[PDB]
């Protein structure tokens, strides 16, 4: 039967590491269908003064493909 | 001196992945004894509609055996 | 161009992930300067009772060396 | 010269390995054209009952890019 | 919500990689219970003569803590 | 904030690592945009003779989602 | 044919690595049966004043389930 | 006691996986003797036309030395 | 006899590989001593346009404490 | 609450594993303050004539920073 | 079909990495025969007065067995 | 200038780890001519009884072809 897909890529938050993987999932979905699991397989950032100013979750995402 | 075993759990949790790890250890101090250590292996999760419902954080556990 | 040096730090916090990078990140910016960028390499924890009373958050931190 | 694309799928089978891969191949092959080698990344399943009804096996195909 | 165990399983065969697998699974399955999902990790074998005369896959197996 | 994309592509050249990966990065930037880091994956290549004829190196491209 | 479990197990010991591992199997075998092989994923230890107060080797060790 | 060398073969079958095992090692048993293991280090194989017309699969021969 | 310390370090260069690690090998030959090797540990880079204008490759350095 | 630094560091003796990594943790030691544990991550060694004459084990050392 | 011996060589050069890999494939190529393809493991070198002095590539060499 | 060949070999020895790669070196030594260098890949053992009777060391060991 099924065949999937999956595809990298990294969501950015100044808040966290949830809302950063939400945001690539959103950004996924707008243009991607039948998402199924994701990966999280590096978590970085940048830092700006002596502070994270952006969390940066690299993720795999699967989906079917129809 | 003494001698520890190392389980791999996962925990689930729709919040987020300090949740997922709690649930896991939680679980893991109902049945076992001596929790001393964890180390976290990998973070997944499961979509639904286009939005995270299951944050999945796998586990190692470190305990002593008496 | 630029050299930077990166290195490895754990930091702690009795409430979580972020808060434990932000404190590595912290004491890293009192004593270094330029701090750019940072990994997680790995997260941890120290168990007490039966819960997380500690979680470590190990990180590399790169900064500009001039 | 020639610029390949590396694209990560996954194949399904209740059958086995070698089906799940070529259910992969099969379906990049109506989508994409040239590809040249695979590598299987990943060997996963799903289990039902006790038993294994569905083989996963996660493989990176290269394709020339024309 | 839930939780769950994974268990490092080598499951033997004369036959190959498939038949291992399920060996495995089938011996996990009179024993533990709600096995969902599992990962090979790898694939060994003991050489007799000169010819395989054990497939030994190691693999990991999910399965729900109630 | 923002969302990026990795894509996973091997440069060619019968010259050198250099060469390979900026005929990569070049393929990448007449189909997307706002490409922003690369990270070296692997390096092969193809004998001829008994001489390199083709260096290949697979990089990962990222580029910001709009 | 036959089907193993593999446990994870970090034996500990003042003295050193071999003594360390001797220990982890000493205490599985009182509880387990057919012991079979092993495998160090891990060194690691304790510092006390300035010196080695425990050396923990983390081990893989398989056992025949009958 | 003994000691081994451990050779890197890469065996290939327009069958499959445990086909392109078995020639692998058959080559080697006409060589070389007293073959004792092998681990599997690495699946690939060749695509044509939309179809995989070779397996390979590259393995790791441990034998006794003597 | 002898100990070593390993820092990490990453160079950079709008003219590549090579060029990249001298200048992290000259930055740390005129604050450190007796450096002996060095590792690479990975090959990164920025895009402006659509091209490399910085190699930054990560670099471990041993050097004699003395 | 405490933020560790990670150094890595390569002790050498003639003599042997434990022996390579005392020497790195007195050196450690001498300069550095609250050694709490140490990792190892790698042994190597220089060969002189047909045997080993200096044993090179690279650890890495957590302390805590106040 | 066919089966390949993979074999582990490291080539040296005061120049770089091409030249480095040339080296060690020149080498192979007197000595071997039907080299077909090559991957970089790793890249480490010599460091002499503060300037690298040898490059060292390792390098993993695929040829036809016949 | 130089080339080198890394050969993977396993040490054998009822008494430890560090005569195990002896004995893989020694073995080596009447074989092969100008050792350089070994690394340490893997440590392995046999367990009769409920103790260890086999330490296996698996290294490879790095020498120059003339
Ligand atoms: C090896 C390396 C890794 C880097 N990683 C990141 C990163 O993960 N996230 C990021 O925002 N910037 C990263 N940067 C960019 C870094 O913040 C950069 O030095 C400044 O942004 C521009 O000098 C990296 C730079 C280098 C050289
Ligand atoms: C390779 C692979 C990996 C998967 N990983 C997960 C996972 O980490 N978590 C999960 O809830 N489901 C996972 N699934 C199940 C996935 O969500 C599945 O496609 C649907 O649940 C049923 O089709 C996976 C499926 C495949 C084929
Ligand atoms: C292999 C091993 C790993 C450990 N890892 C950690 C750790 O990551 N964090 C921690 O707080 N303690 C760690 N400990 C210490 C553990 O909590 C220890 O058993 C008690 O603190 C003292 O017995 C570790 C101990 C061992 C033996
Ligand atoms: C960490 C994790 C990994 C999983 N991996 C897979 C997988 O590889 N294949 C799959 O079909 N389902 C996978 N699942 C889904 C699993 O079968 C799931 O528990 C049930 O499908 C729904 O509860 C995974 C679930 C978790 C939590
Ligand atoms: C490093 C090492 C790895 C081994 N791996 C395996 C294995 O994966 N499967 C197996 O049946 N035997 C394995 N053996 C045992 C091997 O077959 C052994 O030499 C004979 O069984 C007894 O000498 C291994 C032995 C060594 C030293
Ligand atoms: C395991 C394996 C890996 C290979 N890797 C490469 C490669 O990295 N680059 C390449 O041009 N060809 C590669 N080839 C193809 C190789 O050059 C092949 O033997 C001839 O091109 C056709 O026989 C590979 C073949 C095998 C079996
Ligand atoms: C990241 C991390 C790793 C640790 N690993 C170990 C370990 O391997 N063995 C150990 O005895 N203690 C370990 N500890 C505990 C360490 O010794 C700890 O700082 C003191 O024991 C209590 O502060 C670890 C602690 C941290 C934060
Ligand atoms: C990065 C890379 C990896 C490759 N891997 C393989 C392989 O595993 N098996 C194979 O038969 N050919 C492989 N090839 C060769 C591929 O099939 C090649 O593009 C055609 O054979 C000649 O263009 C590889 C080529 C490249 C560039
Ligand atoms: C996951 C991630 C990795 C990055 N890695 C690098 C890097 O290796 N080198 C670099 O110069 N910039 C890096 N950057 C910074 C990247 O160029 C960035 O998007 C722009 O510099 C500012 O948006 C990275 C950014 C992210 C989110
Ligand atoms: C790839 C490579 C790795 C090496 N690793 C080591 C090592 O781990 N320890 C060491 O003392 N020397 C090492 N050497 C140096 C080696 O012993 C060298 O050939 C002679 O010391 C000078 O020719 C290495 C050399 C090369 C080319
Ligand atoms: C852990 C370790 C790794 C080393 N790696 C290398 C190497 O990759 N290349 C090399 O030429 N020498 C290497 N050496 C040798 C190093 O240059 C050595 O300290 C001097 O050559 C003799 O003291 C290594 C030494 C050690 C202890
Ligand atoms: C996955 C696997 C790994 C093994 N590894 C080893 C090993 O490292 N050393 C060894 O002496 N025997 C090894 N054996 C052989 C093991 O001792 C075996 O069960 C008995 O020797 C014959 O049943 C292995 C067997 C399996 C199935
Ligand atoms: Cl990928
Ligand atoms: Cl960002
Ligand atoms: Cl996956
Ligand atoms: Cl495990
Ligand atoms: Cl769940
Ligand atoms: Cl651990
Ligand atoms: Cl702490
Ligand atoms: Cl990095
Ligand atoms: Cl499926
Ligand atoms: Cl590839
Ligand atoms: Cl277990
Ligand atoms: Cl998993
Ligand atoms: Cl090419
Ligand atoms: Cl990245
Ligand atoms: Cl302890
Ligand atoms: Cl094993
Ligand atoms: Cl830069
Ligand atoms: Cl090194
Ligand atoms: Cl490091
Ligand atoms: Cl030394
Ligand atoms: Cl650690
Ligand atoms: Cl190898
Ligand atoms: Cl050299
Ligand atoms: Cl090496």
Chains 1, 2, 3, 4, 5, 6, 7, 8, 9, 10, 11, 12 share one sequence.
Do not use: C, M
């Amino acid at each position: 039967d099924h065949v999937y897909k999956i595809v990298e890529l990294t969501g950015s938050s100044p808040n966290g590491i949830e809302e950063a993987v939400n945001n690539a999932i959103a950004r996924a979905g707008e243009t991607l269908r039948h998402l199924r699991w994701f990966e999280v397989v590096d978590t970085r950032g940048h830092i700006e003064g002596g502070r994270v100013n952006h969390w940066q979750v690299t993720v795999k995402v699967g989906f079917t493909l129809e």
